[PDB]
Design a binder for this molecule. Structure first.
Ligand SMILES: Nc1nc2c(ncn2[C@@H]2O[C@H](COP(=O)(O)OP(=O)(O)CP(=O)(O)O)[C@@H](O)[C@H]2O)c(=O)[nH]1
Lengths: 499, 205, 85, 82
RNA sequence: CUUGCUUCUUUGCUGACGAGUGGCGGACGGGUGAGUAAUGUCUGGGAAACUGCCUGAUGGAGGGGGAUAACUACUGGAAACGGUAGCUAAUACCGCAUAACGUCGCAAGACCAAAGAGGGGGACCUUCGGGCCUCUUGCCAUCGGAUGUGCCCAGAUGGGAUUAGCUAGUAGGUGGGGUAACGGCUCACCUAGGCGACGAUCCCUAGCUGGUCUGAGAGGAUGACCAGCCACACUGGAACUGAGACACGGUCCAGACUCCUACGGGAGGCAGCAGUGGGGAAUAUUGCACAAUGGGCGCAAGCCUGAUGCAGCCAUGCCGCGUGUAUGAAGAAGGCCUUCGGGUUGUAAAGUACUUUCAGCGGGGAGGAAGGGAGUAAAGUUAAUACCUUUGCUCAUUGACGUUACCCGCAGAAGAAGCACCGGCUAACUCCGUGCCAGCAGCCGCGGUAAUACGGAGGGUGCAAGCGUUAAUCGGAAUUACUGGG
C-alpha cells in the first residue's frame, strides 16, 4: 500500500475526439470551471488539472478530415476515449474513421451527446443509429425533457437523482436544487405532467430494450455508455466528473518490441508524440509531449536518447497547469510534459534508462503535394529558410527543397494549407507567399539506399534530386511512370519511412 | 601532408636523382630521365634567376619531403642560429628523424622510412616517436622495438645500406639494428651537390 | 528587486533617523555656542562649550565623527571663545 | 588583506601554478606585489620540480600574510630539516 | 495486545532548523566600452590622509537601564504589503564609573569605550539559575607594518585655424563652513587678474596602456582574446547604510517601454551566464559540478559560487596523422592528341604479398587528489593522564570531465581528397564549340570563323582537410623622404 501506486491510480487520460462543429472547445473551457482552474480548431492543448479527487489529464486535437493527423498517434497515448456526437450531424464518416482508429486498441469509450439547446431527434432513433452504423451497443442512463427548448432536467437510473436546469448560466457557476424521488407529483407539477409521463414511458422502454452496465467488458469497449447534457448551459458536464472518477481504470501498459511495460516499473517511457505548430512569444522549444505513465519524475534526472544512444541531461520540464506553461515542476507518473528541444528529437523517438528497444507507434501517413513557396516581398528569406524548417519536422508539414534554390514545396498531408499561411504572420514570420495552381503529383516516396550503390543513382540523374526536411532525398515525384522507372532502377535499401 | 603520388615524375622534373625511387634495385633508367619531365619535355626553358631559385627550392623540398610552410619554419629556425644560415638549414634538414632513419639504412626509400617511423617501430632513447618532424638532439641512440624488429622489411632494405656511402656522423650496429647519433654534419659531407645559396636568396625577399 | 538580503535596506532606515538625530542634536549644541558668539557673553560661551564638549566627543566615539571634524570644531571654537574673552 | 596563494597559469589540462603574494580582493591572474617561487603539479621526477625562496616568504610572514592551504602544504614540502 | 511488541497526546529537554533580530559579505568575483581629449591612462616624484577583514606590542573588558521584531487579539488590501494594543532576548540600542604616549589647548586643565560566547573539570560553594579553575574565540582604545583607496605636480598620450580669442567662482588673497585630507570644495569682503600661436575656447572622432600584426631598423595601423586602471549598469538626478558605493542582481523621485489588477494600486530592468525578436555577410548550449583553485560566512564540519574546471557546436586560426605500402606490362580497357608511325593518362588501374596509424567494437586503466572525518600514540597547555593546538600513525574514503589520456585484442585496404591556376607578371599545354556575340580579367588586356587568355575534354603545376574570392594593416612605397625626395 505504497502511496506511489495509489497516486498512479489517481492519474487517468481522456483526450477528446468528435465530429467537426461538435463542441470540444466549449466543453474543455467548462471543465476548466469544474476544477477551479479558471477557421476553427487549430491548436492542441493539455489541461493537467487542479481537480479534487484525482488528476485526470486532457489532450485536445483539431477535428477534421484534413486535420486530425495528431489524433492518430495521440489516441495511442490516451487510454480512454470521449465521443461527442450532435443530433443534427449524427454518425458520419468522421465518427466511422474515429471508431476505425479506436477499435484497433480497444479503448473504453464514454460518449456525450452535445447541443441540448437545439432541436434533437428521438433518443431511441439515435441509439439505433449508433448501434447500427457502428455495430457497437450502448447502455443509456438518463434522458432529458421533450424536444426543442424543453430540455430542463436529468433523470438518473443507477443513481436515482432528478436534477433541473436554469437558463443563462454560461458565465457563472450556479447550482439548481435537488429533488430525490422518481414518482414525485411535485416533480410532475414543476416539469409538466404529460411530458413527464412520456419520459417515464421512455425510461420503461430503456429498461425493456437495453442492457445493464459492465466492468470487465467496459475495458474492451463493447457496450459503451452514453451521457446527456449541453455544453453551454453549465449543467450536463457537471455530472461527467463522477463518471471520470468511477469508470476509468489505471493507465494500461503499452506494447514494446519485447513486451508490455506496466505502470509500476522504472526507466521512463516518455517518447515524443507531436512537435506541434507552436506559438512563438520569444522562443520555439518546438514541444515535447510524453508518455511518462511509468516512473515518478526526478528534478535532476538524466534521460537517454535511444535512437541516437546518448546520455542527455534534461532538468527543465514544463507542466501544463490550466493551459499556461508553468514553472519547473515534477509530478506523479501518468502525466504529459513539455520540454525544450532545438532540432534534435523527431516524432516517436524512444526513451528509457538502458532498455534499447522501440515501441509500435508512428501511424503517420504519406502527403499530398500541394503547390509551392514563391516568396512575395523577396527580402529576408531567412525567416522561411529557418522557420519553415522548424515546421518541417512536424507530422503535417515536411518542406521539400529542390536543387534550383527556388520553388520550395510545402508538404501537406491534408488539403487546408491555410494553417501555415496564418502561421506566416508571427514574430519571426513575415513573408506572405499567396497560392496558385502548380502541378506536382504524388507524395515524394522517401528512400535512402545503402552505401556504394546510391552514388551512381545520384550520378545518372543529378538534375532530378530534391533535398527534404531533415536532409533526405526521395526521388522526385512528378508522375507514377517515374516511380515505376525508379522501381525498375532497383534501389536496394535499409528502408525507413520517416512518415 | 604527404605527396603520395608520382614520386618518379619528380626526379624527371628536376632532372637530378631525388632518391625518391631508390628501392632494392639500382639506377633504373626506366623513365627516360633528363629528357622527359612531361608532355613538353623537349622544350628548353629560358630558365631565369627566380626560375633556378624555385627549381632549387623544389628540388631540396622533394629530396627532404618537407612542405612549403614547414620549410619556411625551418628557414626561420635556420636564420636564428649561429654560424651562417645555409649550413644551419641543411643541419636542421638532416636533424629530422626520418632522414636519420634513412641514413641508417632502415628502409629503402624515404617514404618507407617515414612509414617505418609512423607505425610505432622507431624508438629513440627508449621513447617511441611516430612523427618525422622530431629534432634529433646530438648524442642519442635510435633503434627498433622488439615487437616490430626484423619482419624482413628492415632486412633486405639494409642491404642497400651496404651500397651507400655510409657517412661519418652516424654509426649503425647492424647486428641488433641499434643506431648511434653523433656530432652535427659538416657542409662538405652531405651530398656535395645541392645549393643552399639559391634557397637563401629566395627566402631573403 | 527581490533579494533575501533586503534587511540591510530597512535597517539603514532604522539608522537614518536615529544616528542622524544624534547628529542633529550635536550640531544644535554647536549652534547654541554660536548664539553666544552673537551674544558677547564669555561666561555663557564657556558654559556652552563645557556643555557641548563631552557630547561631541561621544559622537566622535560612536563612529559618526572621525574625531577630526569634532577636533576642528573644538579647535576653532576654542579660538573664538578665547579671542572673545 | 594580503595573502600568499596560487595563480593558476598554464594551458587546458596542463596546470602550472604561481605562488605569489597578492591582495585577496584582486583577481587570481590580476595585480600582485611581487612573485616568489613557483609550483608545477605535473612535475614528476626530473631536474627541477619546485623552487621556493623562503626568505621573502618569511619576510611576508613578518608582515602578516595569511598562508593558504596549498602554500602551507608547499612549506611542509620544503622542510627546514629535510 | 506477540505487556514492553506496536499505536499515540504533550514535551525545545537534544541533534538540528522555515521565518525574525543581529554580525559579516553584498564596494570582491562577472559583463560592456556608451560617455570621456583630460575630471581618463602611462612614466616619475610628493604629502596636507583613511584603511574592516591579516598581524606585532601595550592596557581594559566594571556596573545598569529602556524599547523592538519574531509571538499574540483585532483589523485594511485582490495581490504587493501593513496598522493598532501588549510580551521578551542578545555580540542590537543607550546612559553611569574609568582612563593613557588618544582629541583640543602654548601649557594648566576638560573630555573620550566595550561584549561576551563555546569545550572540559579537582577542592569549595550550590536560594541546586550556577559561581569558580583552565583553554579557544570575539570586543574596545592607541602606536605601528603591509595591502587597497582618496589627493597634488611635471612630461607624454588624434585630427581640423574653413575654430583666434576664451573665462565672471573666472585668476589670486583674507576670514567662516565642509571633506578620512591640501584644496573657490563651498559662502562674505578686496584687486583685476588667468589661459593662448611652444594651438587657449569650439567641432568631429576615440576608452587608455602593457601588448598584436608588419617592417633590417626607424616608423605605420591596431589594442579583439590575457592582464592593470578608468567609466557605465533602460535615461537623468539625489542621498542613507557601510572602513570602502554617491552603488549590475540596494533606496527614492521624474521620463520611456512590457505585464497584472478585484482597477484602489503595483512588478520589471540579461552592456551576467544560457537562450530569443530585430540588425547584419558574420558568431555557440536555455549542459554537468563545487572533483581542484579562488571569493563570501562559520572555530570546524558543512552551504553558495553561470568565476572557475570542464562537456556540446563552428575547419574560425595553428599543428599533427591518415585516406595504403612494396611489387606489378599486355606497356590491357576507356578518354585526349596525331604526320594516324605512335605518344599521353600510366606503376597509374586490374592481379599478388603484407600492414592497419586514425574511425567501429570488446576489456584493463593512470594523473589532475591536496585535503576533510573517525580512532590511537607522543609533545605543549593547565591542578588535571579531562578539553583544545600541532605531528607521526590505523581505517573508511572525496572525479563533472569519464563510454577519460594511454595500453591490449577482433575483423577487413576495409570508412576517409578535395580546391585554385595554366599569355606575361607567377608554377604549367594541346584539341573541340562559338565568333568584338556569349564572355574573362588584380595590371599589360583577349575574343572581328585556325582563342596556349571565353565555355567543355585531356594533361600538367601549386596547396592540402583545406583551397580560391572579397574586406582591412604593414612591407615592397625613399610614391610623405627624421633615417630617406625635390
Ligand atoms: N447552444 C449550444 N451551442 C453549442 C453547444 N456546444 C457547442 N455549441 C456551439 O457549436 C459550435 C461548436 O464550437 P466549437 O466548440 O469550436 O466546436 P469544436 O468541437 O471545438 C470543433 P472541432 O471538432 O473542429 O474541434 C459553436 O458555435 C458553439 O457555440 C451547446 O451545448 N449549446
Amino acid at each position: 500500500l505504497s502511496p506511489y501506486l495509489q497516486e498512479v491510480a489517481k492519474r487517468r487520460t481522456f483526450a477528446i475526439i468528435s465530429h467537426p462543429d461538435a463542441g470540444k472547445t466549449t466543453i474543455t473551457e467548462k471543465v476548466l470551471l469544474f476544477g477551479q482552474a479558471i477557421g476553427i480548431s487549430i491548436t492542441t492543448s493539455v489541461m493537467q488539472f487542479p481537480y479534487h479527487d484525482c488528476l485526470v489529464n486532457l489532450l485536445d486535437t483539431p477535428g477534421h478530415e484534413d486535420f486530425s493527423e495528431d489524433t492518430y498517434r495521440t489516441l495511442t497515448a490516451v487510454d480512454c476515449c470521449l465521443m461527442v456526437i450532435d443530433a443534427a450531424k449524427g454518425v458520419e464518416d468522421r465518427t466511422r474513421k474515429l471508431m476505425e482508429v479506436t477499435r484497433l486498441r480497444d479503448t473504453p469509450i464514454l460518449t456525450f451527446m452535445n447541443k441540448l439547446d437545439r432541436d434533437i431527434r428521438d433518443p431511441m432513433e439515435l441509439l439505433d443509429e449508433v448501434e447500427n452504423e457502428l455495430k457497437i451497443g450502448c447502455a443509456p442512463i438518463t434522458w432529458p425533457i421533450g424536444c426543442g427548448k424543453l430540455f430542463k432536467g436529468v433523470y438518473h437510473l443507477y443513481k436515482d437523482e432528478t436534477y433541473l436546469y436554469q437558463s443563462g448560466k454560461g458565465h457563472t457557476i450556479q447550482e439548481v436544487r435537488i429533488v430525490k424521488g422518481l414518482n414525485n407529483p411535485d416533480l410532475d407539477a414543476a416539469v409538466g405532467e404529460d411530458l413527464a409521463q412520456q419520459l417515464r414511458d421512455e425510461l420503461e422502454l430503456v429498461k425493456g430494450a437495453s442492457n445493464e452496465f459492465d466492468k470487465e467488458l467496459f475495458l474492451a469497449g463493447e457496450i459503451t455508455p452514453v451521457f446527456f447534457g449541453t455544453a453551454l448551459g453549465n449543467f450536463g458536464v457537471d455530472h461527467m466528473l463522477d463518471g471520470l472518477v468511477e469508470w476509468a481504470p489505471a493507465p494500461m501498459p503499452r506494447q514494446t518490441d519485447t513486451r508490455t511495460v506496466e505502470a509500476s516499473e522504472d526507466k521512463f517511457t516518455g517518447f515524443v508524440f507531436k512537435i506541434q505548430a507552436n506559438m512563438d512569444p520569444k522562443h520555439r522549444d518546438r514541444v515535447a509531449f510524453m508518455r511518462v505513465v511509468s516512473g515518478k519524475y526526478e528534478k535532476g534526472m538524466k534521460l537517454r536518447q535511444v535512437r541516437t544512444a546518448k546520455d542527455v541531461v534534461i532538468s527543465d520540464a514544463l507542466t501544463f497547469m490550466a493551459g499556461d506553461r508553468s514553472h519547473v515542476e515534477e509530478a506523479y507518473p501518468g502525466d504529459i510534459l513539455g520540454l525544450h528541444n532545438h532540432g534534435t528529437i523527431q516524432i516517436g523517438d524512444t526513451f528509457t534508462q538502458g532498455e534499447m528497444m522501440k515501441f509500435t507507434g508512428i501511424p503517420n501517413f504519406a502527403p499530398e503535394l500541394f503547390r509551392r513557396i514563391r516568396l512575395k516581398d523577396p527580402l529576408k528569406q531567412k525567416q522561411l529558410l529557418k522557420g519553415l524548417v522548424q515546421l518541417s519536422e512536424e507530422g503535417a508539414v515536411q518542406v521539400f527543397r529542390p536543387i534550383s534554390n527556388n520553388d520550395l514545396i510545402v508538404g501537406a498531408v491534408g488539403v487546408l494549407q491555410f494553417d501555415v499561411v496564418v502561421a506566416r504572420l508571427k514574430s519571426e514570420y513575415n513573408v506572405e507567399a499567396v497560392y496558385e495552381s502548380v502541378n506536382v503529383a504524388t507524395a515524394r516516396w522517401v528512400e535512402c539506399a545503402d552505401a556504394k550503390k546510391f552514388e551512381e543513382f545520384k550520378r545518372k540523374n543529378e538534375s532530378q534530386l530534391a533535398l527534404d526536411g531533415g536532409d533526405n532525398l526521395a526521388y522526385i515525384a512528378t508522375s507514377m511512370v517515374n516511380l515505376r522507372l525508379a522501381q525498375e532502377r532497383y534501389p536496394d535499401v535499409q528502408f525507413h519511412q520517416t512518415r | 601532408a604527404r605527396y603520395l603520388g608520382p614520386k618518379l615524375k619528380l626526379s624527371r622534373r628536376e632532372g637530378t636523382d631525388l632518391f625518391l625511387k631508390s628501392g632494392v634495385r639500382a639506377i633504373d633508367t626506366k623513365c627516360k630521365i633528363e629528357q622527359a619531365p612531361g608532355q613538353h619535355g623537349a622544350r628548353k626553358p629560358r630558365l631565369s634567376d627566380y626560375g633556378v631559385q624555385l627549381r632549387e627550392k623544389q628540388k631540396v623540398r622533394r629530396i627532404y619531403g618537407v612542405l612549403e610552410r614547414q620549410f619556411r619554419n625551418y628557414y626561420k629556425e635556420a636564420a636564428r642560429l649561429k654560424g651562417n644560415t645555409g649550413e644551419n638549414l641543411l643541419a636542421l634538414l638532416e636533424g629530422r628523424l626520418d632522414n636519420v632513419v634513412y641514413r641508417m639504412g632502415f628502409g629503402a626509400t624515404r617514404a618507407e622510412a617515414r612509414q617505418l617511423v609512423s607505425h610505432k617501430a622507431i624508438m629513440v632513447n627508449g621513447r617511441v616517436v611516430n612523427i618525422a618532424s622530431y629534432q634529433v638532439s646530438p648524442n642519442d641512440v635510435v633503434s627498433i622495438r622488439e615487437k616490430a624488429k626484423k619482419q624482413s622489411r628492415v632486412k633486405a632494405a639494409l642491404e642497400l645500406a651496404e651500397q651507400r656511402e655510409k657517412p661519418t656522423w652516424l654509426e649503425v650496429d647492424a647486428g641488433k639494428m641499434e643506431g648511434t647519433f653523433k656530432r652535427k654534419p659538416e657542409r662538405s659531407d652531405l651530398s656535395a651537390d645541392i645549393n643552399e645559396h639559391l634557397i637563401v636568396e629566395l627566402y631573403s625577399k | 528587486n527581490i533579494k533575501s538580503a533586503k534587511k540591510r535596506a530597512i535597517q539603514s532606515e532604522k539608522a537614518r533617523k536615529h544616528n542622524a538625530s544624534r547628529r542633529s542634536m550635536m550640531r544644535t549644541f554647536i549652534k547654541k555656542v554660536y548664539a553666544a558668539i552673537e551674544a558677547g557673553d564669555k561666561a555663557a560661551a564657556q558654559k556652552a562649550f563645557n556643555e557641548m564638549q563631552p557630547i561631541v566627543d561621544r559622537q566622535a566615539a560612536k563612529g559618526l565623527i572621525h574625531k577630526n571634524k569634532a577636533a576642528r570644531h573644538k579647535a576653532n571654537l576654542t579660538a573664538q571663545i578665547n579671542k572673545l574673552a | 588583506m594580503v595573502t600568499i596563494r596560487l595563480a593558476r597559469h598554464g594551458a587546458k589540462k596542463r596546470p602550472f601554478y604561481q605562488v605569489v603574494v597578492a591582495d585577496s580582493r584582486n583577481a587570481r591572474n590580476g595585480r600582485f606585489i611581487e612573485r616568489v617561487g613557483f609550483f608545477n603539479p605535473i612535475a614528476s621526477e626530473k631536474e627541477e620540480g619546485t623552487r621556493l625562496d623562503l626568505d621573502r616568504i618569511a619576510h611576508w610572514v613578518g608582515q602578516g600574510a595569511t598562508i593558504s592551504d596549498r602554500v602551507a602544504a608547499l612549506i611542509k614540502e620544503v622542510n627546514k630539516a629535510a
